[PDB]
PDB file of C-alpha atoms and ligand atoms in Angstrom:
ATOM      1  CA  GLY A   1       0.010  -0.004   0.007  1.00 26.57           C
ATOM      2  CA  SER A   2       2.006   2.979  -1.283  1.00 26.42           C
ATOM      3  CA  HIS A   3       1.145   6.653  -0.594  1.00 26.90           C
ATOM      4  CA  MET A   4       0.949   6.980  -4.353  1.00 25.83           C
ATOM      5  CA  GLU A   5      -1.795   4.483  -4.725  1.00 25.26           C
ATOM      6  CA  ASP A   6      -3.992   6.139  -2.092  1.00 23.30           C
ATOM      7  CA  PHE A   7      -3.125   9.460  -3.624  1.00 25.65           C
ATOM      8  CA  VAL A   8      -4.422   8.371  -7.046  1.00 27.43           C
ATOM      9  CA  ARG A   9      -7.719   7.093  -5.557  1.00 27.13           C
ATOM     10  CA  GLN A  10      -8.214  10.502  -3.932  1.00 29.68           C
ATOM     11  CA  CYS A  11      -7.143  12.591  -6.844  1.00 28.78           C
ATOM     12  CA  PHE A  12      -9.123  11.035  -9.718  1.00 27.45           C
ATOM     13  CA  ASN A  13     -12.700  10.188  -9.940  1.00 27.33           C
ATOM     14  CA  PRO A  14     -13.817   6.592  -9.348  1.00 26.48           C
ATOM     15  CA  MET A  15     -14.790   5.968 -12.880  1.00 26.46           C
ATOM     16  CA  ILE A  16     -11.244   7.005 -14.094  1.00 25.09           C
ATOM     17  CA  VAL A  17      -9.604   4.933 -11.388  1.00 26.11           C
ATOM     18  CA  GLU A  18     -11.602   1.920 -12.432  1.00 24.64           C
ATOM     19  CA  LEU A  19     -10.889   2.304 -16.155  1.00 22.87           C
ATOM     20  CA  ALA A  20      -7.182   2.579 -15.460  1.00 25.40           C
ATOM     21  CA  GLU A  21      -7.090  -0.538 -13.164  1.00 24.27           C
ATOM     22  CA  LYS A  22      -8.810  -2.436 -15.976  1.00 24.22           C
ATOM     23  CA  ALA A  23      -6.370  -1.097 -18.604  1.00 22.36           C
ATOM     24  CA  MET A  24      -3.402  -2.138 -16.435  1.00 23.85           C
ATOM     25  CA  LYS A  25      -4.754  -5.548 -15.709  1.00 28.53           C
ATOM     26  CA  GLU A  26      -5.497  -6.152 -19.298  1.00 26.70           C
ATOM     27  CA  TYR A  27      -1.819  -5.469 -20.384  1.00 25.67           C
ATOM     28  CA  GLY A  28      -0.513  -7.611 -17.492  1.00 24.22           C
ATOM     29  CA  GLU A  29       0.070  -4.955 -14.778  1.00 23.81           C
ATOM     30  CA  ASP A  30      -0.556  -4.310 -11.105  1.00 24.62           C
ATOM     31  CA  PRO A  31      -1.780  -0.897  -9.815  1.00 18.51           C
ATOM     32  CA  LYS A  32      -0.496  -1.686  -6.321  1.00 13.32           C
ATOM     33  CA  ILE A  33       3.056  -2.305  -7.463  1.00 11.74           C
ATOM     34  CA  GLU A  34       3.405  -0.119 -10.524  1.00 11.97           C
ATOM     35  CA  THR A  35       1.965   2.975  -8.970  1.00 11.15           C
ATOM     36  CA  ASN A  36       3.591   5.696 -10.998  1.00 14.98           C
ATOM     37  CA  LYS A  37       2.193   4.055 -14.113  1.00 15.07           C
ATOM     38  CA  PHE A  38      -1.206   3.878 -12.407  1.00 16.33           C
ATOM     39  CA  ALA A  39      -1.055   7.656 -11.839  1.00 13.72           C
ATOM     40  CA  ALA A  40       0.000   8.244 -15.414  1.00 12.71           C
ATOM     41  CA  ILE A  41      -2.707   6.191 -16.923  1.00 13.86           C
ATOM     42  CA  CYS A  42      -5.311   8.004 -14.754  1.00 15.13           C
ATOM     43  CA  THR A  43      -3.924  11.310 -15.894  1.00 13.78           C
ATOM     44  CA  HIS A  44      -4.014  10.371 -19.567  1.00 16.97           C
ATOM     45  CA  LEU A  45      -7.600   9.136 -19.194  1.00 16.31           C
ATOM     46  CA  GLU A  46      -8.710  12.391 -17.565  1.00 17.61           C
ATOM     47  CA  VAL A  47      -7.070  14.528 -20.183  1.00 19.35           C
ATOM     48  CA  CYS A  48      -8.519  12.539 -23.062  1.00 20.64           C
ATOM     49  CA  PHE A  49     -11.975  12.950 -21.528  1.00 23.02           C
ATOM     50  CA  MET A  50     -11.508  16.658 -20.737  1.00 21.56           C
ATOM     51  CA  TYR A  51     -10.350  17.027 -24.358  1.00 18.99           C
ATOM     52  CA  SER A  52     -13.434  15.252 -25.849  1.00 20.31           C
ATOM     53  CA  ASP A  53     -15.502  17.697 -23.771  1.00 19.20           C
ATOM     54  CA  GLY A  54     -14.075  20.669 -25.750  1.00 17.63           C
ATOM     55  CA  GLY A  55     -15.799  21.386 -29.037  1.00 17.54           C
ATOM     56  CA  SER A  56     -19.381  20.596 -29.986  1.00 16.39           C
ATOM     57  CA  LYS A  57     -21.893  17.721 -29.306  1.00 16.61           C
ATOM     58  CA  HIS A  58     -20.937  14.980 -31.797  1.00 17.32           C
ATOM     59  CA  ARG A  59     -17.463  16.069 -32.560  1.00 15.84           C
ATOM     60  CA  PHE A  60     -15.360  13.242 -31.139  1.00 17.49           C
ATOM     61  CA  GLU A  61     -15.664   9.517 -31.059  1.00 21.11           C
ATOM     62  CA  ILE A  62     -13.828   8.426 -27.901  1.00 21.59           C
ATOM     63  CA  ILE A  63     -11.518   5.428 -28.251  1.00 24.97           C
ATOM     64  CA  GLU A  64      -9.412   5.528 -25.068  1.00 21.52           C
ATOM     65  CA  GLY A  65     -11.122   3.986 -22.121  1.00 22.53           C
ATOM     66  CA  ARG A  66     -12.676   1.112 -24.072  1.00 20.78           C
ATOM     67  CA  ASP A  67     -11.740  -2.577 -24.077  1.00 22.22           C
ATOM     68  CA  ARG A  68      -8.883  -3.210 -26.559  1.00 22.05           C
ATOM     69  CA  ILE A  69     -11.174  -5.299 -28.715  1.00 25.60           C
ATOM     70  CA  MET A  70     -14.052  -2.832 -28.788  1.00 26.34           C
ATOM     71  CA  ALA A  71     -11.760   0.074 -29.351  1.00 29.81           C
ATOM     72  CA  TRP A  72     -10.512  -1.656 -32.591  1.00 31.21           C
ATOM     73  CA  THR A  73     -14.087  -2.357 -33.658  1.00 33.64           C
ATOM     74  CA  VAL A  74     -14.986   1.235 -33.477  1.00 35.56           C
ATOM     75  CA  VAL A  75     -11.746   2.162 -35.213  1.00 35.00           C
ATOM     76  CA  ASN A  76     -12.650  -0.217 -38.014  1.00 30.99           C
ATOM     77  CA  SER A  77     -16.161   1.301 -38.203  1.00 34.19           C
ATOM     78  CA  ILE A  78     -14.823   4.765 -38.525  1.00 34.02           C
ATOM     79  CA  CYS A  79     -12.232   3.568 -41.184  1.00 34.96           C
ATOM     80  CA  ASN A  80     -14.715   1.578 -43.164  1.00 34.58           C
ATOM     81  CA  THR A  81     -17.148   4.502 -43.287  1.00 35.64           C
ATOM     82  CA  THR A  82     -14.945   7.589 -43.724  1.00 34.23           C
ATOM     83  CA  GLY A  83     -12.463   5.944 -46.078  1.00 35.13           C
ATOM     84  CA  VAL A  84      -9.673   7.142 -43.607  1.00 35.01           C
ATOM     85  CA  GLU A  85      -6.675   4.750 -43.272  1.00 35.63           C
ATOM     86  CA  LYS A  86      -6.540   2.144 -40.456  1.00 34.48           C
ATOM     87  CA  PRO A  87      -3.826   3.229 -37.928  1.00 32.30           C
ATOM     88  CA  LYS A  88      -1.161   0.732 -36.656  1.00 29.74           C
ATOM     89  CA  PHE A  89      -1.664   1.778 -33.074  1.00 26.05           C
ATOM     90  CA  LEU A  90      -4.830   2.579 -31.224  1.00 26.73           C
ATOM     91  CA  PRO A  91      -5.628   6.385 -31.155  1.00 24.20           C
ATOM     92  CA  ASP A  92      -7.527   8.163 -28.271  1.00 20.84           C
ATOM     93  CA  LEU A  93     -10.151   9.995 -30.255  1.00 20.91           C
ATOM     94  CA  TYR A  94     -11.572  10.554 -33.753  1.00 21.50           C
ATOM     95  CA  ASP A  95     -12.335  14.013 -34.911  1.00 21.20           C
ATOM     96  CA  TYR A  96     -15.472  13.955 -36.985  1.00 20.89           C
ATOM     97  CA  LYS A  97     -15.125  17.650 -37.771  1.00 19.89           C
ATOM     98  CA  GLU A  98     -11.531  17.471 -39.108  1.00 19.44           C
ATOM     99  CA  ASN A  99     -11.602  13.795 -40.140  1.00 20.15           C
ATOM    100  CA  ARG A 100      -8.754  12.435 -38.269  1.00 15.99           C
ATOM    101  CA  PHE A 101      -7.689  10.206 -35.507  1.00 17.03           C
ATOM    102  CA  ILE A 102      -5.892  11.924 -32.628  1.00 13.13           C
ATOM    103  CA  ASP A 103      -3.511  10.623 -30.050  1.00 14.04           C
ATOM    104  CA  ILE A 104      -3.176  12.767 -26.952  1.00 14.43           C
ATOM    105  CA  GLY A 105       0.200  12.664 -25.085  1.00 13.29           C
ATOM    106  CA  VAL A 106       0.835  13.716 -21.536  1.00 13.23           C
ATOM    107  CA  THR A 107       4.588  13.958 -20.616  1.00 13.87           C
ATOM    108  CA  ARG A 108       7.037  14.694 -17.782  1.00 14.62           C
ATOM    109  CA  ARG A 109       9.808  15.533 -20.379  1.00 14.94           C
ATOM    110  CA  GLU A 110      10.424  18.295 -22.984  1.00 15.24           C
ATOM    111  CA  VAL A 111       7.333  18.471 -25.253  1.00 15.01           C
ATOM    112  CA  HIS A 112       9.842  18.274 -28.104  1.00 17.47           C
ATOM    113  CA  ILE A 113      11.465  14.968 -26.900  1.00 14.41           C
ATOM    114  CA  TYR A 114       8.044  13.202 -26.375  1.00 13.76           C
ATOM    115  CA  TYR A 115       6.597  14.544 -29.700  1.00 12.46           C
ATOM    116  CA  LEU A 116       9.519  12.974 -31.789  1.00 11.34           C
ATOM    117  CA  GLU A 117       9.231   9.628 -30.042  1.00 10.57           C
ATOM    118  CA  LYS A 118       5.422   9.279 -30.726  1.00  9.76           C
ATOM    119  CA  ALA A 119       5.902  10.517 -34.301  1.00  9.40           C
ATOM    120  CA  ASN A 120       8.587   7.924 -35.081  1.00  9.60           C
ATOM    121  CA  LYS A 121       6.793   5.253 -32.981  1.00 10.98           C
ATOM    122  CA  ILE A 122       3.300   5.861 -34.461  1.00 11.24           C
ATOM    123  CA  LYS A 123       4.835   5.598 -37.980  1.00 13.27           C
ATOM    124  CA  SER A 124       1.282   6.601 -39.123  1.00 11.18           C
ATOM    125  CA  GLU A 125       1.507   9.656 -41.434  1.00 14.21           C
ATOM    126  CA  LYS A 126      -2.277  10.509 -41.018  1.00 16.25           C
ATOM    127  CA  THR A 127      -3.028  10.251 -37.168  1.00 14.99           C
ATOM    128  CA  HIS A 128      -2.871  13.776 -35.486  1.00 12.86           C
ATOM    129  CA  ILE A 129      -0.704  14.209 -32.308  1.00 10.10           C
ATOM    130  CA  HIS A 130      -1.316  16.674 -29.410  1.00 11.01           C
ATOM    131  CA  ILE A 131       1.028  16.607 -26.441  1.00  9.62           C
ATOM    132  CA  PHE A 132       0.593  18.375 -23.132  1.00  8.39           C
ATOM    133  CA  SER A 133       3.068  18.595 -20.303  1.00  9.77           C
ATOM    134  CA  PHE A 134       2.871  19.193 -16.575  1.00  5.80           C
ATOM    135  CA  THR A 135       4.431  22.411 -17.335  1.00 10.50           C
ATOM    136  CA  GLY A 136       1.959  24.172 -19.541  1.00  8.73           C
ATOM    137  CA  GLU A 137       3.625  23.378 -22.811  1.00  5.47           C
ATOM    138  CA  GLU A 138       1.697  21.734 -25.699  1.00  5.25           C
ATOM    139  CA  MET A 139       2.802  20.664 -29.270  1.00  7.23           C
ATOM    140  CA  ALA A 140       0.401  19.556 -32.011  1.00  7.11           C
ATOM    141  CA  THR A 141       0.759  18.142 -35.565  1.00  9.08           C
ATOM    142  CA  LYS A 142       0.833  20.941 -38.344  1.00  9.58           C
ATOM    143  CA  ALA A 143       0.603  23.545 -35.368  1.00 10.81           C
ATOM    144  CA  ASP A 144      -3.086  22.746 -35.466  1.00 13.89           C
ATOM    145  CA  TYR A 145      -4.377  22.562 -31.918  1.00 12.97           C
ATOM    146  CA  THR A 146      -7.998  21.285 -32.769  1.00 10.04           C
ATOM    147  CA  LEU A 147      -9.767  23.003 -29.859  1.00 11.20           C
ATOM    148  CA  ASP A 148      -9.971  26.596 -28.831  1.00 12.25           C
ATOM    149  CA  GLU A 149      -7.608  27.954 -26.347  1.00 10.87           C
ATOM    150  CA  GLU A 150      -9.817  27.843 -23.186  1.00  9.00           C
ATOM    151  CA  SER A 151     -10.373  24.103 -23.524  1.00  9.49           C
ATOM    152  CA  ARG A 152      -6.653  23.465 -23.694  1.00  9.74           C
ATOM    153  CA  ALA A 153      -6.009  26.018 -20.945  1.00 12.61           C
ATOM    154  CA  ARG A 154      -8.135  24.114 -18.454  1.00 12.83           C
ATOM    155  CA  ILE A 155      -6.364  20.776 -19.270  1.00 11.90           C
ATOM    156  CA  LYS A 156      -3.012  22.486 -18.606  1.00  6.79           C
ATOM    157  CA  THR A 157      -4.298  23.892 -15.361  1.00  8.94           C
ATOM    158  CA  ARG A 158      -5.570  20.557 -14.232  1.00  6.44           C
ATOM    159  CA  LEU A 159      -2.150  18.900 -14.919  1.00  4.96           C
ATOM    160  CA  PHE A 160      -0.230  21.541 -12.988  1.00  2.00           C
ATOM    161  CA  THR A 161      -2.661  20.876 -10.109  1.00  2.80           C
ATOM    162  CA  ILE A 162      -1.899  17.193 -10.199  1.00  2.00           C
ATOM    163  CA  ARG A 163       1.799  18.045 -10.277  1.00  2.00           C
ATOM    164  CA  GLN A 164       1.420  20.234  -7.110  1.00  2.00           C
ATOM    165  CA  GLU A 165      -0.618  17.699  -5.124  1.00  2.00           C
ATOM    166  CA  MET A 166       2.013  15.148  -5.866  1.00  2.00           C
ATOM    167  CA  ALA A 167       4.864  17.413  -4.851  1.00  2.00           C
ATOM    168  CA  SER A 168       3.127  18.420  -1.586  1.00  2.00           C
ATOM    169  CA  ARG A 169       3.225  14.743  -0.866  1.00  2.00           C
ATOM    170  CA  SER A 170       6.882  14.201  -2.018  1.00  2.00           C
ATOM    171  CA  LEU A 171       5.723  11.846  -4.803  1.00  2.00           C
ATOM    172  CA  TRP A 172       6.529  14.262  -7.649  1.00  2.00           C
ATOM    173  CA  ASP A 173      10.335  13.493  -8.044  1.00  2.00           C
ATOM    174  CA  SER A 174       9.719   9.854  -7.989  1.00  2.00           C
ATOM    175  CA  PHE A 175       6.908  10.353 -10.453  1.00  2.00           C
ATOM    176  CA  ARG A 176       9.016  12.494 -12.861  1.00  2.00           C
ATOM    177  CA  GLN A 177      12.085  10.082 -12.590  1.00  2.00           C
ATOM    178  CA  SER A 178       9.766   7.018 -13.242  1.00  2.00           C
ATOM    179  CA  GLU A 179       8.709   7.992 -16.778  1.00  2.00           C
TER     180      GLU A 179
HETATM  181  O1  LIG B   1       0.716   6.987 -24.285  1.00  2.00           O
HETATM  182  C1  LIG B   1      -0.347   7.291 -24.919  1.00  2.00           C
HETATM  183  O2  LIG B   1      -0.600   8.503 -25.130  1.00  2.00           O
HETATM  184  C2  LIG B   1      -1.349   6.252 -25.442  1.00  2.00           C
HETATM  185  O3  LIG B   1      -2.468   6.812 -26.022  1.00  2.00           O
HETATM  186  C3  LIG B   1      -1.086   4.942 -25.413  1.00  2.00           C
HETATM  187  C4  LIG B   1      -1.928   3.769 -25.976  1.00  2.00           C
HETATM  188  O4  LIG B   1      -3.090   3.961 -26.281  1.00  2.00           O
HETATM  189  C5  LIG B   1      -1.361   2.320 -26.218  1.00  2.00           C
HETATM  190  C6  LIG B   1      -1.407   2.197 -27.737  1.00  2.00           C
HETATM  191  C7  LIG B   1      -0.382   3.110 -28.416  1.00  2.00           C
HETATM  192  C8  LIG B   1      -0.698   4.359 -28.965  1.00  2.00           C
HETATM  193  C9  LIG B   1       0.244   5.169 -29.601  1.00  2.00           C
HETATM  194  C10 LIG B   1       1.559   4.748 -29.743  1.00  2.00           C
HETATM  195 CL1  LIG B   1       2.796   5.774 -30.575  1.00  2.00          CL
HETATM  196  C11 LIG B   1       1.866   3.493 -29.204  1.00  2.00           C
HETATM  197  C12 LIG B   1       0.933   2.690 -28.559  1.00  2.00           C
HETATM  198  C13 LIG B   1      -2.168   1.183 -25.623  1.00  2.00           C
HETATM  199  C14 LIG B   1      -2.231   1.216 -24.115  1.00  2.00           C
HETATM  200  N1  LIG B   1      -1.043   1.164 -23.444  1.00  2.00           N
HETATM  201  C15 LIG B   1      -0.135   2.135 -23.934  1.00  2.00           C
HETATM  202  C16 LIG B   1       0.045   2.086 -25.510  1.00  2.00           C
HETATM  203 MN1  LIG B   2      -4.285   5.749 -26.349  1.00  2.00          MN
HETATM  204 MN1  LIG B   3      -2.551   9.012 -25.981  1.00  3.29          MN
END
C-alpha cells in the first residue's frame, strides 16, 4: 500500500480509477506495485476525456477507455465509413469535424522529446498528435491545436494541479524520474 496508490484514488474520480485498473490488468500490470504508471494512466484518461469535452456535441468519437477489442471495432467502423486509413496503433479519439484520428500525449519531459518519439513510434503519417506537459507546454501536428484555447487552458491547469498535489506529498520526483 504505497502513498501513491492512495493518492491516485483521492485525486481522480472513481470511474477514471476503475478504467485505469482495468487497462493495467489487461496489459498484465498491477496498480499496487506499478503505482507511478497507475497515476500516469489515470492522468491520460482524464485529459482525453476533458479534451473530448471541448468542441461541440458529436465532434469526437472516444476510443481511449474502451476494451482493446471494442476500441478496434470502433476504429474499423470509422475507417470503413470515412475511407480514412486504419492506424497501426490505437488512437484516443476521432475528430469527426476534421476527419482524423488523434492521439493525446501527456509527458514529464520536454514536449519536443516526447513529440519525436510518438511521431517515429506511431509511424502513421495521417493520425494527429497533441502533447501536453505538466508544465503548460503543448505541441500539435501541423501547429493545429483542434480546440480553442480555453479548452486546452483548463487541461493544462488541471495537470499543474496534479503536479502540485504530488509534490506536496513528495511523490513528484519519484513520479518524474519514473517515466
Ligand atoms: O501513451 C499514450 O498516449 C497512449 O495513447 C497509449 C496507448 O493507447 C497504447 C497504444 C499506443 C498508442 C500510440 C503509440 Cl505511438 C503506441 C501505442 C495502448 C495502451 N497502453 C499504452 C500504448
Ligand atoms: Mn491511447
Ligand atoms: Mn494518448
